[PDB]
Every structure is written in structure tokens, then in C-alpha cells.
Design a binder for this molecule. Structure first.
Ligand SMILES: *[C@@H]1O[C@H](CO)[C@@H](O)[C@H](O)[C@H]1NC(C)=O
Ligand SMILES: *[C@@H]1O[C@H](CO)[C@@H](O)[C@H](O)[C@H]1NC(C)=O
Ligand SMILES: *[C@@H]1O[C@H](CO)[C@@H](O)[C@H](O)[C@H]1NC(C)=O
Lengths: 136, 144, 137
């Protein structure tokens, strides 16, 4: 099965759980796509089912919370890429980035809040990824 | 044919047509890619040729118009994801987002301006998408 | 081989080289992915190994440097798409865009800084792309 893809969104203003405060992981409640069921909605983590090149994209949308944030795409406790978002009232802004990375079976991909907080919720945030092609 | 992909850009300063004012749809005049010819440039809509997982990306670039905007990727006239863009003169701002969604044959994907306007044009804006992989009748239909 | 993909990032605060000032090309020092080895790290340019539809994405992250910038994706010395980024101190912001384009073998893809400068470095910047599917004559 070379068909692997997932897509998740934050669909509500709801505040960060105590677990979020603890783990600093950005959680996505609603999953539009999860072929291969390789994305664990509970931990909001993608576990690669096989060795290959995966694509990832994320947009973390925040509101005026008096805070500036930094989101990082994580690979097994290692940062791959980072995105930033300032603080102002006129609009929402997004910490967005994307990348191709090689993953091994059982490698974990997820988003971490490296800085700031997501008070006021992070509605409209998105996290998606898919296997571009596998490797031997 | 599992090869399906399209790419369109806004290449001019030109203002929104009177049609745009009514439909609130973001139109892209120049098409760089349209394999399968499933993207109709005139109405700027992607009609899925088959059931599968599709990727979509868009960057809507605006100029200072005293309004803040919200762009949404639409699936059969209902929003899937949204992007925002502030109001600023020193620079252009982009309402950007992207997502993977399941589509059925005849499902329509396009960008609609949920709020604000694009006076001053939306030059350099981009909208693209492609079939990641198809699906058979074993998979249930998507909820949207 | 229909497997072609590359991914590069700017991992340091380091300033633009004297070469960068001349060519206006945005350079990425660290390569996360380069299947087919079609991405030249030295010149930060992707040379298409075959005719097909390629996907490209880039995020150029700048800091407060008294300048506003414009980054463009170049195809054989011609701009395809562009991105912009204002100037303010409260945060970093990114000039981001992406597109699908048809390329033939030997076509060159790279990022050029059309305006402003990247003093203060462009750390956390990203540039990636891959062959979606090939095409025949
Ligand atoms: C999480 O931390 C914030 C402070 O950043 C606090 O206001 C909030 O009550 C905490 N939420 C939970 C569920 O612990
Ligand atoms: C569209 O509406 C705006 C105000 O929302 C108006 O200024 C503009 O003139 C309208 N478009 C045209 C073509 O008249
Ligand atoms: C590159 O150019 C900028 C401004 O044009 C200048 O401040 C900087 O010193 C230059 N760097 C080198 C290495 O020439």
C-alpha cells in the first residue's frame, strides 16, 4: 500500500487542554482524511507505516493573545522546520511552513508549540501530510 | 488515468469583474497546468474526474484596500478551510492555506472570498491542486 | 525512475555572501532530501531530470532589517510566482508561495530575491519540490 495520507483541522475556539500545557503538542480535533489510519487523532501524531519520502504542511492560526508563538514540525523529538506568528488585533495570522522529509517505519511526526501559548484557541489551523513515494 | 493536476495564477492588477462582486469567487486568468483538463479557467473551478484524495494549495495576494479578507477553499459551495490577511500598505499580504480532501466524481473545488474585497487586484495569487491517489468503491463517501 | 524530490533549509543566522549580493539568489545550506540528486546545493538550483509536472514550495523567513522583500521562483531566469514580506520587529514573517509547473529536462528552478535584502539572515527558510508525475512527448 503506497497510498498514505492524512488531514486534520482545528475547528473550534476551545482552549488548550491541561495535557497541551504539559506536552506542548498542538492537537487537531477534526480529521478530514486518514488513509491507512496512520494518524493518531488522540495524540495528533503521524506514525509512518513504511520507509519513504513524506510531505507535510501545517498552518497554525492564532488570535490576539498578547503573545507571539513559534511552531515546529517534529520528527522523533527533533525539530525539522519552524514557523512564527506575531501579535496584533487587526487580524488572525498563521505560522505556516512545509517540507519533504525521509521517514522510517515507526517515525513520529507532529507539531510542537516551541514558544508562546494558544489562548483564544487555534481555530482554522490545519495539519496534513502524505507519502510521496516509498523507499527500499 | 491517475494523472490529474492543475495550476493557475493571477497575473494582472485588473479589478474584480461585476460577476465577481456577485459570486464572490476568486478567478485566475492564467493556467500554467491543467492535465486532464479538469480545471475550468473561465469559472475557476476544479471538477474531480474520479474518486480519490486531492491536494489543494492557494495563496491569495492582496493590496491595501482598507478591508481585511478571508479566503476559503470551497467544496460544493461549502467551506473546508480558511485563510486570512490583514490590512497593510507597506506590503502585500497573503491568505494562504492548503489541505488534503477526499472528493467524489463531479465534486467542485474553488476559492470563494468569504469576507472583504479584492480591490486593487490580487496579482501574484496562486491556486493549484492535484490527485494524490485515486480510491475504489471499497472506500465510503466523504462527509461534507 | 519516477521518484524525484528535494528539500532544503536555511539553518543559520549567517549573513548573505558577497556572491549572494551579486546573483540575488537565495541559498540553502542544509539539504534534508535530494532523491535523484537533482538539486545542486552549491547553486541552490533544481535541474529537472525529465519532462513532467513538478511541485514547488518555498518559505523565506526574514527578520527586521529596515527592508521589505520580494522572493520569486525562477524558471530558466524567468519569474513564475512571487511572495512578499513586510517589515516589523514584533515577529519574523515569511514570503511564501507554491505552484505546479511543467518542466522539460535541463530546466532550472531556483529562488531569487527581487527586492530588498536578507540582512540578519534568513534562518528557518525552506525550499522543497518533487515530481508529481512525468510526461511523454
Ligand atoms: C493552560 O495554561 C494557561 C496559561 O498559559 C492557563 O491559563 C490555562 O488555564 C491552562 N489550562 C489548563 C487546562 O490547564
Ligand atoms: C464590488 O463591490 C465593491 C464594494 O464591496 C465596490 O466598490 C465595487 O465597485 C464593486 N465592483 C464593481 C465592478 O463595481
Ligand atoms: C551585501 O549587500 C548589503 C547591502 O547591499 C551590505 O550591507 C552587505 O555588507 C553586503 N555583504 C557583502 C558580503 O558584500
Amino acid at each position: 500500500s503506497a497510498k498514505v495520507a492524512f488531514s486534520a483541522i482545528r475547528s473550534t475556539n476551545h482552549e488548550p487542554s491541561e495535557m497541551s500545557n504539559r506536552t506542548m503538542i498542538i492537537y487537531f480535533d477534526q480529521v478530514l482524511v486518514n488513509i491507512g489510519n496512520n494518524f493518531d487523532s488522540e495524540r495528533s501524531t503521524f506514525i509512518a507505516p513504511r520507509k519513504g519520502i513524506y510531505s507535510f504542511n501545517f498552518h497554525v492560526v492564532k488570535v490576539y493573545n498578547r503573545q507571539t508563538i513559534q511552531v515546529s514540525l517534529m520528527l522523533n523529538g527533533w525539530p525539522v522546520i519552524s514557523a512564527f506568528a506575531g501579535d496584533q488585533d487587526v487580524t488572525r495570522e498563521a505560522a505556516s511552513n512545509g517540507v519533504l522529509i525521509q521517514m522510517e517505519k515507526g517515525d513520529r511526526a507532529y507539531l510542537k508549540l516551541e514558544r508562546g501559548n494558544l489562548m483564544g484557541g487555534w481555530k482554522y489551523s490545519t495539519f496534513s501530510g502524505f507519502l510521496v513515494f516509498p523507499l527500499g
